Amino acid sequence: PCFVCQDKSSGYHYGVSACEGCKGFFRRSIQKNMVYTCHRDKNCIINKVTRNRCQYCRLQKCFEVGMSKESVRND
């Protein structure tokens, strides 16, 4: 399962087993240098059914579980 949200994985992406959503989200976040904010306590639950409720916490978990922004290639 996806290390970030436990949805079905599509293989390794940026260093971890990940679903297509967390893969795409991470890529976009890095490619565009997105900066997010948490409207709650920066401790939001991130699973298959809640991952889109907080981009800040989703990204934060992407890094925590070991996604590597250095595997996002330059333009």
């Binding site: 409207h39 889109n52 409720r53 907080c54 981009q55």
Partner: protein, 84 residues
């Protein structure tokens, strides 16, 4: 592209594609989403078989929603609020 893309199955207005399972316009997509999110209940002042087309789609909310469902719209395709 062509000025013809798709057509709303509920009222006949222009459509860019499917929403909640069915070719629909911005109006009918929005009306369905709001109905589901707020669990609104409507009543028909006539015989529950009002005609739904572009010019009268707002006249009877009951019959507009019932046609959304009858043409195939899926309540469960409406998601939770995001903020993201």
């Amino acid at each position: 592209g062509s000025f013809t893309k798709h057509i709303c199955a509920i009222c006949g207005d222009r459509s860019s594609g499917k929403h909640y399972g069915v070719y629909s316009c911005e109006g009918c997509k929005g009306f369905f989403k709001r109905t589901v999110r707020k669990d609104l209940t409507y009543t028909c002042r006539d015989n529950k078989d009002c005609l739904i087309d572009k010019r009268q789609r707002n006249r009877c909310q009951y019959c507009r929603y019932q046609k959304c469902l009858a043409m195939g719209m899926k309540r469960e395709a409406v998601q939770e609020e995001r903020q993201r």
